[model samples]
Target chain A: SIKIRDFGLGSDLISLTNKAGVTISFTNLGARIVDWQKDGKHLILGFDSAKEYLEKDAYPGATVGPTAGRIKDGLVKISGKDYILNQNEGPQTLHGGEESIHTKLWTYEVTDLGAEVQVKFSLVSNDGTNGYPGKIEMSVTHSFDDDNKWKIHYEAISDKDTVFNPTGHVYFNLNGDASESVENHGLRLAASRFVPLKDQTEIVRGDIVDIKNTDLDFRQEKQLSNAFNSNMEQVQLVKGIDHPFLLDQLGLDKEQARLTLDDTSISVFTDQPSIVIFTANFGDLGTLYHEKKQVHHGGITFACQVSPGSEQIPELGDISLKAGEKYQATTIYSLHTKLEHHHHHH
Target chain B: SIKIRDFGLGSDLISLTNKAGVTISFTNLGARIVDWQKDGKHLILGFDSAKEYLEKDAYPGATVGPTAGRIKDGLVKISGKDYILNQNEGPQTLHGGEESIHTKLWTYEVTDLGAEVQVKFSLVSNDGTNGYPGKIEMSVTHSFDDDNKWKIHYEAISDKDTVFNPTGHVYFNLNGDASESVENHGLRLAASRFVPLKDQTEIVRGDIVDIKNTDLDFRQEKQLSNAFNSNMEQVQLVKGIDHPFLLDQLGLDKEQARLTLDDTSISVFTDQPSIVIFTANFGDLGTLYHEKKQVHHGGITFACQVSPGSEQIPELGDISLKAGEKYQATTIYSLHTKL
Candidate 1:
């Protein structure tokens, strides 16, 4: 069934709870998914009170982009003219700009397809917004099948030359608790190479290196704690994994990546060229979210998008959308659980 | 005697050891007191390596301000004209801006005053720097007296009408460790009224209230653990005691406040109008400063300054300085211990 409520400050919160005990809640502000629960367990990190979402710094389950990751110095030279972007993350433009669409209100529509529940969020960005040169019409459709497959489809059309890359910035804990760290969770990725970030800036240094002979190689399912706390310089630079692993194709497949906690598990299939696995090393929420609530290394964010800083590195991919061009992307999250514990005694 | 060393990045770090087994260290970067040790015990929270100071988030033991504390939206109307300040702590301007004096290099001069060792840090801020209008000459003199008194004297002269309020941002654990919480420490402040803050933004709402019936009435020394975790609104606002208690005078006195922990104790004497007692409730350093280092609620900061958000509220006193007028303020941290 679909439920709607006022989220204060003139925002509408729409929620869909399936008969399978899976519930997903979203708000027009940022067009973000505030909650994702399965069997009475909250699988996503969020505040119980809707107003608390206003103070979030980690973006939670936001629809990210015009450019998803860090852009070096907030400057991207297209053709020959330089477009100066709003720098939010200290000298770099992080997760778009400070006032990106993630914080904006979007119009939404919902439909119950019996087999699946669908919600589509629509927004229009005027030309010259955040220094981008385009009138962009964007829509993100979220569909949840009764079999526990939650899929997100993103589509955009631009009327001028501009950069456009959208991704779902969702941090999952799988344990259904926001306070618990995802260190014990097992993860596996099929990518063989990752975009190397420059120092702590996280700007792409224009090179994608092989993950073999590196701690970032997640070809095999292993405990997140094993490689996240390793002595690798890349891991230590950002305190955890925040690298974009290049994908071979932009389509749904069974060999992409798998994440598992104690009993619940999830499989990620994205039609994006790269997925940035972030360990949430800097997810210290302090007292901003709720009374006495603190989230330290609690969630793991898997951001699927074009290569971060792809606009600066032409070799990675072209993120430019011209007049009359259409861009589309899709990502599917399949959830499953076991009836018994999987804790192996060493 | 004082010792000097190169702190990298062309900065000179000077250390002074007094006769009372007290040592204080300073670096030219922001003229910050990098360390303060009592009998070889590091009493304040600091990084061992000077380069690590660049990664600190809560401004450790550095000299802060062109204006300290929260300025409502970084907007202050001076003589009917609005002067925009850089906002760092959300919508409010906190401890100046991101590129405040804490991140600037200061020219320093060291001198020995017989019973005390003093270092004066001088800097000049030109007009339009950090959205602030002023050509100000500032000097903060740090003097460590032989009897364990680490005094800070701040003086600034501005060529244009500008706001200037400085304070020493030093977090002390007294246990000489950043890994332990200061919840067991004893604290007392001699003030009847406190500036009420507006929710989590902590902007002074232009009013003062009596602390007679409130838990903030720390007239009598009590354990920090008693009220920090209480259900009080002010306590939960910033998670702890980050309040500026109104004082009676602006000269050195024995009636300000006193802090005690374990076997060591210290008294605070300042000429500032108010003193902010912070319980380090939000002090989490992550793993940036040192390897695997974490500072949960481990230290307490005692910031003495003019009333926070003083520019918006005139009853807090004047922080404005003009040409040919010298802006001078003094705060003395007289450290003491039980033999």
Candidate 2:
């Protein structure tokens, strides 16, 4: 599984297939994931053609950034100075607003490292744009190998302190069909506490609370329908569990979440403070979906981020980038089957 | 041969064997070549024990430098400041004098690059240590693989102007026996001009001259004995073919010289301005040779380096490394056999 080749029109793409025929494809449009298929099943939600990804609001298959989610009142304090960021979701900056890094096209470079192949996308964001403080050079590198392992690493260097929290917005529907739902998909998230979102803006700028006896608890594996049926205030407000759960630990080696469908499974690993699970929460999606298939509750996202704090509410965590500092984050997805109870990493 | 292992007291040697069973071993002592064997024949001259290398004057298999050869009057001018280097040879500095890089034990790091393996030796030369300015961090990297290709790379960076010309002082006796001389070996050198040395100093600090019809012309291959017997004044003064030949061109891909013993051959490729060939002319050299074998005319060397000019004549070539400059050179040796 090692190389980046052409699959154009929708745009230039990188397609790598391991010796076992597990294929993963991506495009430079948004440095987005186009497909991650194995044995005829596409695990990631993507349009068959590349053009659809050139357009997005939910950031489908795209990498969202600068600062993912929202900053309270669109206000941010960096190095004792106050700056107002663009607010697209009414007074709150929603995923860095419109024309964010998630919307602009990016430049990519492909490399061969003997044992594995990697594709890196780079971009430069100038100071004061989107009201951010300094010029930042960012690179997103994706490494894939024959072991069915996929790792996404993000790195950036800025001249001044700034806010940064980036994540991939790839949704999953184990069966690979956009017309189906994830009602039967089992999820196990290793988080001891969760931050609940509020009404309209679903503003998640809040404090952390234990999941000990709450419907938000995902510390143990349970079917997706269980949380969907609970219909609690927080879950019902966002239509499903679209909140951020404080992770048990932060490291690429720690299992933050695991998703399963019958015998097939996908384990998640990341160096993030929390994981965000969003059960497709809608029914309008149909035509633009891959193959133009009619869909409802089409898939779910396992978007992880630097959740909860900084100076907002110290208990949640932090994602502050001080001047002259490097920002690095990595998230990995590994394929597995029901029979494999323990995974060994070499 | 993809890793470094316990070859101990010959001192932590890096012995890598290619897929073809060709083995090349090196030690941290001067980051020296201890062996290069294929089919039981050692293409390089070396002792059986590692301890002998911890000692040298001929350098044997060690890497020599900050400045190789000799600098006339031991006087070197850098950035308008005159500096005097220690002179070991009469009235001249020879191979950087006394405790040059060639004698010091270096620190090494081994690396594996899929198809090939490499060992790199690193050293730091402080400013004014050997009469040179600036603190320079230098590294000598040697890479080898199954194809029987050996590459020696030298890299350094100085904070101020300094002189640097490093080379491997390795002797080769293709037959694997130190007692067997290279008298019958064929030599092909891609040089149009040669530099002659005078008297005991062999102070090669001279002007370059064309070899047009001179016996020094080696554009075409000839037997080693042919040059030895010519007895030309220049050749006789050095006791053999001990002179620097200005290369026709400089590049690692350009073939500069080739030595063939019967059927086996070694092709030289370098980015150096000249190649210095020396025939082992001593009769007092015996024992201490690998296997303690009685020997004479034991081996020969194809030492390539930056020769001729800098601020001196600008005709030979330049070796003056300026402040904030990087010095990098590479020489490669590839082995082939008779059908």
Candidate 3:
């Protein structure tokens, strides 16, 4: 039961809220997010109509994974030395060998940030979580602003001189409901070339080429509908945008805005090095969405991740974070309406 | 277009009448039981559908495969000889190393059993279809009566004396619809104790198991609804029923008198030596019911198979088909309402 407040702290748990629906809870002992809502009726954040608006309002600020972004071949080559990493995603070492930062339990400190109750989650990975080889202490701040923009800020510190490419992976849709399939939405990415992964020992690095005439080049806003007609070899390779972009990795490069999605009424904005556009194609386990509504290819997921090309291509940017450095990355969400064509629907 | 008739002779192409809908034409090039509704535009019995279906339909037609049924520890003995088979289904040889007769195309010939189109399909397994001996010529006849009664009769003749136990791979859903989940559907088997498979293998075979206290017992009526309950060890073991029963092999044993599905008014009967009951827990290729409803589990495959205990359990029955000898087993299905 979250008590709703306008511009300060919102939502206090009330007893009356607990009497409505049966709570379906499932904990797999490790991954907390894995124990998500058995159905939409067991809404987690939505406490009341105001709370519903807040939950319908709040951004699900969760870590993407130990390997939120792609590591080239799951092996890192820094200072001319190669380090082997655990491969989880098919052949590549993904999300820190399945036990990444996001997969771990975070110590949440619920505090007030402007008009929002910000949940700041922190977790420490000792030395080797998934073979990246580093003690990484990371903190993620999830807060909803007065403007109703749920902002997620990721900050981290490491004790080892290892690669740290922290990213915020909260999939957003200004379209309000999570059930509304994002297939009809149009999308745009800032960068030109994407990191093409090839294999020497495994699929690690390839060439950083232009996005000309390629379906991957989201430079010019393309409708998600266009993917259905895709005949490109790469489009069929990774299914839909399951790979990473070799975008210009200038961390905090506000000029190089990652992505923007626009439907008829709403438009989306993200400020990250690379924006990974993904459509959930995995068969439903009936957790987040309602059972009947949970089809394989329904909802859309867009992850703001560090481009994979940073380690592979030095020209992109530095993907490595030393022991003394404090890593900082901000993912901003700017919600705007096409007021010019806004018409009320009955 | 299918011209359904009940003449004594096998159904002819000219005798094929339309089942009343948009019908896609089929020929010897391939077989078809396609749904021609406005939304139900799909093939049900084509070589392609068979290939795709066999690749995934683990317990299709109730015909056990690879080392047909389980070979305790996946080791077989033929005349005091131990032959090691490949592990196809996880740790055991499965339906003839992927290229078993279950996946092969049978040359079909139609017959008049009131069947809309009686098709007879046959194939010859040269020596080894999953590491057994002898060239086995197998034939399966598929026919349907005018009163919604479909029949599948199986026969196989071997050239040399080798160990062999083959069964029909046909899924039966008395409800006759794919959309209707097989949860509330009742099932009955004629066996008492099931053959507890070896530790090395996953396929459970061996006794005429009764469906009493345990999940494997289907001696009496049991709904498939609670079959997937995670607590059921046997159900959780091989995912679902992907095994053979030591089916009473005794003689003409009566099965829950013919699986009577009351809701949709359908009943299945078999005179075969053994009846393998398996509900389609997974894999739905969108087959529609008679009412044009998209049947979700269009595949509750019940293969009227042979109980495999010829060597071990002699008390069961005479389960042997000698070299150069042929064997036949028949099954019948009829649909009627409880008016």
Candidate 4:
């Protein structure tokens, strides 16, 4: 069933519930999926009020980017033409810019495919918006299947040469509660290499290094706290895992990453070229919510997207969209939990 | 020489100049010391504008307490009479609630003590201001000695039965810069034991444990980063060190804790019962200032006072003040640097 409600600021919040009991709530503002749950346990971190969402440091569960991630000082060269972007992060263009898709409201459409329900949100960005060229029309369709898989399909078209890379900034915790840290959770990634970040900034050093014998090596399932306490400078740099891992070349059919907490589990299957695994290193600000205080290691975010800094790294992925060209990306999150055990969760 | 400027809201911002080139600025609001500088560095995390001071969480370089730390569930039984308090940290009373002395504007008096400049700030709180009983008259004198020692002397008198555990909440980073974390700073505390905090809340567990095998062992100088990355649960609880260490029973006038960075150093000599060392683990909320952005291991705060949560734990220290009784405490932060 799809339930629509007012989310203040004249925004609409739409919720979709599947037969398997998985529910997802999204707001028109930024086409953000504010909550994803099964039963009463919210599997993601969010606020009870839309006002708090507006005050968040970074986009909480909002869609990120006209181009996601960093672009090295907002400089992007597309087909020999240079485009300057808004510098949001220190000396870098982080998550597009200040006025990226995370702040925009989108028109939505609801559709039912048997036991599955999906909501398609569409937005149009004019040329020179955030210094990117061309008028880009983008649509993101989020569907919840009866098999308890939340699937996101993003498609975009631009009237001129431009950059397009959008990602969902969703913070997840298998426990479904954020008051406690996610240190006990276990994570595993099917990645052999990851993009190394610069000293102080999140700018990609434009090189991918092997994760072998490194704390980032999540080839085998390991407790999150182990990786957090690793002697690796990368882990110590940001205080936890906040690096982008390079995914296998196998398209949409492969499992990219898996997260588990007790009996509940979540797995990501995406067509994207990379996934940024952030252990919510820097927790949320102390706000008025059920989880009122900042919960360190509260939630882990697995953001799958085109290779971060793709505008600069040619071998990673091409993010350039020209006239008559189509951009497509898809990611699916499959969740599973035990019936009796879930009753005691969150 | 001392200079006074007008801060917004009709408050006054006072700056004290010392012979050692040490400069300290403070605002009348909460008698909060806003800046401490030496050479070209701002040695503490503070705001250039008074407006930011008004928006800070709890007491940032401001005088804290009718009671400094948490009183479990705001519970305080005085002379067999239970008085409810303002709950600030969940069910517990943290600092002194929203109406603590930190938010009050204090009357000030400045004096030139030869080469040293001193500022005395006084305030009177009527009975039941923030759910505490008593018409209390409190005074805090901040003296910047020519030798670079920033000394604080706190005294109070209550007209009714009340509690007094006032302390300065100064954030120090001898580097005079907060752009980077204070990870490299070396720290050594005189204490051998520390009060452990509860897992979920900042409430004191009423037990003092030895630091012999624990990460709280600052018996010897250790880099701040070592304590930050400690595997102890207490370090993980607050995400950093916000523990109240137990001091020797021997009276005051001794080297308490020493902090060093580069060629600069700060040594604490206090008359108080204990000191709280906080690594500012969870740094400031993102705001616009010279030290913009959240510096992870930011400024380290050394708060000297009676043991935190003393009102609940009898062994900690007595914070209860009766009518006509006087409360007094002093702490001197001696700053030393290479020429």
Question: Please, what are the lDDT tens digits per residue for candidate 2 over residues B1-339?
Answer: 454543322134678888888888886656678888889888988865444554423377778877877777788777667877766777677777555676544556678885788888876664544566656778999989878899899999986788888888888988788788788888888898888675666665446678866777879998878777776888777777777788987788888999998889999999898887778777665746665563556788888897623335467776789877888899898989888
Q: In candidate 4, what are the lDDT values of residues B144-209, reduced to their tens digit?
A: 978888888898998778878888999997666666788899998888888898666888887778
C-alpha lDDT values of all predictions = 0.75, 0.74, 0.47, 0.77
Residues B217-237, candidate 3, lDDT per residue (tens digit)? 666777665564546656665
Error of 2 at B127 (Å): 53
Angstrom error of the Cα, residue B109, model 4: value is: 48
Runs with alpha carbons beyond 4 Å of true place in candidate 1? A283-292, A339-341, B1-339
Provide i-RMS per model in Å.
20.6, 23.8, 27.6, 25.0
Clashing pairs in 1: B250-B271
Best-fitting candidate, measured by lDDT? 4
Model 4: DockQ score = 0.01
Clashing pairs in 2: B1-B16, B1-B17, B309-B317
lDDT of 1 by residue, B48-160 (tens): 65457765553778888888888888888776699767666787778876657776556566788889888988766644445555556789999898888888999988766
CAPRI-wise, candidate 2 is: incorrect
- Cα lDDT of model 4 by residue, A203-286, tens digit: 777777898767778888777777878978777777787888888565788877888877788889998888988877764554
The per-model DockQ list reads 0.01, 0.01, 0.01, 0.01
TM-score of chain A of each: 0.93, 0.92, 0.69, 0.94
After superposing candidate 4, which stretches have Cα over 4 Å from the reference? A287-289, A338-346, B1-339
Worst 10 residues of 1 chain A by lDDT: A285-294
